[PDB]
Design a protein around this ligand. Structure first.
Ligand SMILES: COc1ccc([C@@H]2C(C#N)=C(N)OC3=C2C(=O)C[C@@H](c2cccc4ccccc24)C3)cc1
Ligand SMILES: COc1ccc([C@@H]2C(C#N)=C(N)OC3=C2C(=O)C[C@@H](c2cccc4ccccc24)C3)cc1
Ligand SMILES: COc1ccc([C@@H]2C(C#N)=C(N)OC3=C2C(=O)C[C@@H](c2cccc4ccccc24)C3)cc1
Ligand SMILES: N[C@@H](CC(=O)O)C(=O)O
Ligand SMILES: N[C@@H](CC(=O)O)C(=O)O
Ligand SMILES: N[C@@H](CC(=O)O)C(=O)O
Ligand SMILES: [Ba+2]
Ligand SMILES: [Ba+2]
Ligand SMILES: [Ba+2]
Ligand code: NA
Ligand code: NA
Ligand code: NA
Ligand code: NA
Ligand code: NA
Ligand code: NA
Ligand code: NA
Ligand code: NA
Ligand code: NA
Lengths: 412, 412, 412
């Protein structure tokens, strides 16, 4: 009742409109995009014509994807070279502990919400191990292994190599410094390009979401995850940030708002990574030393929203199948949904492809994934926002916990 | 009558032979190549054997293509970082204005010469836009998009990215300088390699042209463009250079002679770019700051000879078809032939592939391109020389017009 | 009798076990690998399951292959920039003379051993020439030409380009130094990663050899080459090193032992190159200036063991065919087996693929290669050890012969 009477003052909206021009434009892009897409929905237009329509949104995807490679490689090489090897292990343990806990908490919340509301696989593990260790760095930049090398950048392989290379340069001293300085100039220069890409974003988001918007049991399921992601995203994660930092978490979420709205549009944790960087480094004022450490790793392994969706959908398909509830086999679901969360790449429709792991483990048929394909796209847009939000709050949490190591490196 | 009596003095030919050793060798390579090719023309030898024969000319192509990538990327990153953002816009406006005017003048001359002597397409625009914004920089270095990613370097995508990256580094100051210095050493080092490639050029040009030389209406057509390119190339463009600089243009053409003779052999504006660089920077003494700005851009968009050929061939196929002459539809030909000129890549047989755009716009059948395929190769060799000559004179024109901006950067 | 009574002292084995922990572990990996492979040999397991089994050995291959590219490119660019152009020709002549002589001596020894114990092709030359001059440097990093561009790094193309680039930077002075320093930091940093890869090697070698171990005339043939490689490897090459340096060669072989045991496991001169570098630079204390000069070149052209195997197998298939012994045609075998040695890439099963050249030249049928395929893998493991051992002793021989040039560069 106190904040309500405070809200009626009609104070400073002209200053807000002037400052938040771009932020409000992308919000308007979502509003206009939903309106346009539903207006143009009666489709006497072929999928070829759908591709033609969504083209302005496609150029935004090419623009964002462009920067992913120089962004990850320069961030981890400089970031890990900036820190002392032992401090990097400390920072790393903070990240890993935060990642596993938040993913374990999301999968438990996900299982509880479905148990209340009733709405080869070995080759996958070897392909993952194969990608952690790329045989060629030039090819790793635009191809991933799939048992033989499918198209699309091997983010994980580059994440791992850049880290080991970063540690090596840190151990080289002065001889190493030249290369650390080379990669620092390349990071800031690609960060300077994401400033340009940001002005195109409202035009892109409008067309990217408008194009995608062009039995009843699958209906209740969509409502389950959406509710589950609001509990984790807007209630679980903020109180975690508040409990650790003692800072207002909803003001932090306001800073990374452009990153969430772009995640909602692209449905890629990797594509929105350059914008998550711009938001945290600037708007939230997070340290570059730790955003370069947390964000490229969080974008591929820290998938809180995917984990919640993996558990929900693994139990949802079992409802139709009338599969028996085993006290020990539900434990395998929480284990494999956390496993698939880490595994699944930060790219669209990667959630559904990793369901093969979680469906096999329990003993459910993998061909049931076909039922969940139709509605997936909308749940993917939301799942991505929670996967990004986790890396953003994760950076804020780690930065706060690692202030001693950061103050030592600020000596000179 | 005064220059004629002056020419009879038999003075300084031994000094000319000693100095112009390489220049005269490549001229002799064309003379020996035409003789050898016609001598070996009776072909009881398969296309496989033709490939075997033309192999010394193939090694020259691999050698020149090799350097294109480090040459474009280092030239635009340093070149645009060297200049103040506002001066880069001034230099840019001079280039764009020169490019569009010369291309508009060539297409008008081309249309006049044919109207006196009577001898999907949307997917193309989207593919071009897609290539201006590459989704992966490593893949952009050896692949282009074609609706899905065909082989062959995306020169345009790299031209655009290098420019935006160059502007970014220029805005970084000292932090940026390291990377600008890194790309400056990489430019001069690859420029040092083109000095070596130049000694192989006479052997390559000989075999490259000899291999290619191994109804009657298509006969008069070939004579139309050849005459049209001599009017534009040796009369239109030199008087433009003279009107702007007041310097003798045929002495400038003498400096870039090795670049034209290599264009005549390869039929690629991109492949002869490292040699156009060596000729302008040295022989013509043009500024590196502006050759790095003009030449990589001119090689892909400034296609004067292609534009003249596009107009000539669009009207030539209509002669056979007896297609009606519309005052407003000839205006669409001048517009789409200028459009295709900009579009068409600086690689062999790219002129004929972009005829699809100009034939569709008017309302002529695209399957008529098959008639023009046989004679094309020879017209392509000449068209390329005019496309290169335009970038060479264009550099000389811009350098002269931008002497104030260049004198400011020479302060220290 | 003097070294025998000296060996009975039971002195310093605890110091040896502590120091040579890793060296003895990889030896134990071979012992355990042979035992495990023969134990698991009864195969009710498919080739798919064989791939699953050999997976720890596959990760070692991806790890070693990863570093090959930054290792070759940084070694030759810095190495050749470090030296004066004339000194590089001197060092080069020492290498080339050593390479051709040792390969000529191995093929002569190989021919003698078989003549005592009786147990298109033009397209190949053009493909080699095409690869010496790559048309694209980014593609050269992960593809080779095959008449059109097959997968797998073009080591030769990068070896050649890095050398020409190294010479260019050396001729640039100070402007060049930045890039030389850039590539020096990148060499030491990738050399710092091979230290990590080395700890995985015993686990990898165990599984790499165990997986591969899972008429009678082809039996005697295998014994011929194995004996021939022991004569060249353990008798011919050491006395050559002793005659040149006057240093004990079997103490040198002890230093590069990890490199030979890894060659025995991988059967790739290129994959074991980062470990041959670590052994020579450290264990044998060879100069970085010359290991960067000798080793990347030796890994592809200096194939002593392959040459001996090429001669042995070219004459062995003629035994079955009862092909006539011509005094002049045996001279063509020694010539083409030396030719194929240089040609054949430092990768597994490359020896048998280049037999096409040596079988055609004499007049034997190329389809006979099928008979030698079954036993090849084991002979390849040994052939590789002799191909590596040659580069290792070659570095030691060149370093010793070039001490004047090295002492001049140590001035400052
Ligand atoms: C596969 O998914 C990953 C990769 C990385 C991480 C952690 C992380 C984050 N966020 C980053 N930036 O660096 C390190 C991490 C460590 O736990 C360990 C830490 C580390 C400390 C000290 C020395 C190291 C040497 C090499 C590599 C990592 C090292 C680096 C977690 C999961
Ligand atoms: C697609 O085909 C092209 C690309 C480039 C150009 C012009 C050109 C030439 N020649 C070069 N080297 O740079 C710039 C040009 C401009 O007009 C604008 C100019 C510019 C000035 C100031 C800031 C900029 C920031 C980013 C990019 C270009 C900028 C750069 C013309 C057509
Ligand atoms: C295709 O297989 C090869 C490539 C290289 C070599 C020799 C070698 C070794 N080992 C290395 N590192 O460099 C040079 C070699 C020369 O003989 C010549 C030497 C050289 C000296 C002076 C100037 C040069 C300029 C460019 C290239 C090589 C040059 C370089 C032999 C065979
Ligand atoms: N598309 C999601 C991952 C998923 O498909 O679950 C993301 O990039 O965050
Ligand atoms: N081959 C020409 C372009 C064309 O095909 O018209 C050039 O590169 O200049
Ligand atoms: N595999 C051998 C070459 C060969 O196949 O003969 C090596 O790399 O040394
Ligand atoms: Ba430091
Ligand atoms: Ba400056
Ligand atoms: Ba020096
Ligand atoms: Na998590
Ligand atoms: Na993520
Ligand atoms: Na993941
Ligand atoms: Na023009
Ligand atoms: Na051009
Ligand atoms: Na063009
Ligand atoms: Na040899
Ligand atoms: Na070798
Ligand atoms: Na070889």
């Amino acid at each position: 009742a106190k904040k309500k009477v405070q809200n009626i003052t009609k104070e400073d909206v002209k200053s807000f409109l002037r400052r938040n021009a771009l932020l409000l434009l992308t919000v308007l892009a979502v509003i206009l995009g939903v309106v346009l897409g539903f207006l143009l929905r009666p489709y006497p237009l072929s999928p070829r014509e759908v591709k033609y329509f969504a083209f302005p949104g496609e150029l935004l995807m090419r623009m964002l994807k462009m920067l992913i490679l120089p962004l990850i490689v320069s961030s981890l090489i400089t970031g890990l070279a900036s820190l002392d090897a032992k401090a990097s292990g400390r920072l790393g343990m903070r990240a890993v502990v935060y990642y596993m806990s938040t993913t374990i908490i999301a999968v438990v919340l996900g299982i509880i919400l479905v148990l209340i509301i009733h709405p080869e696989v070995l080759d996958c593990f070897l392909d993952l191990a194969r990608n952690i260790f790329p045989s060629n760095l030039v090819s790793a930049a635009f191809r991933s292994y799939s048992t033989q090398e499918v198209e699309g950048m091997n983010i994980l392989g580059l994440v791992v190599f850049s880290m080991v290379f970063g540690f090596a340069l840190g151990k080289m001293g002065e001889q190493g410094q030249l290369l650390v300085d080379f990669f620092n100039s390349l990071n800031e220069a690609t960060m300077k390009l994401v400033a340009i890409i940001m002005w195109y974003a409202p035009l892109g988001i409008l067309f990217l979401i408008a194009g995608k918007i062009v039995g009843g049991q699958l209906g209740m399921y969509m409502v389950t995850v959406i509710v589950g992601l609001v509990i984790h995203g807007l209630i679980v994660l903020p109180l975690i940030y508040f409990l650790i930092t003692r800072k207002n978490p909803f003001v932090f979420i306001a800073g990374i708002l452009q990153a969430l709205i772009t995640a909602l549009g692209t449905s890629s944790s990797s594509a929105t990574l350059p914008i998550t960087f711009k938001c945290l480094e600037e708007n939230n004022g997070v340290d570059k030393r730790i955003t370069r450490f947390v964000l490229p790793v969080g974008a591929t392994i820290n998938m809180d929203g995917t984990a919640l969706y993996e558990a929900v959908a693994a139990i949802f398909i079992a409802q139709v199948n009338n599969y028996e509830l085993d006290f020990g086999q539900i434990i395998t679901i929480s284990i494999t949904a956390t496993a698939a969360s880490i595994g699944a790449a930060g790219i669209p429709q990667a959630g559904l492809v990793t369901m093969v792991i979680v469906l096999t483990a329990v003993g459910l048929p993998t061909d049931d994934i076909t039922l969940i394909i139709a509605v997936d796209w909308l749940l993917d847009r939301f799942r991505t926002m929670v996967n990004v939000l986790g890396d953003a709050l994760g950076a804020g949490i780690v930065e706060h916990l690692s202030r001693k190591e950061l103050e030592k490196q600020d000596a000179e």
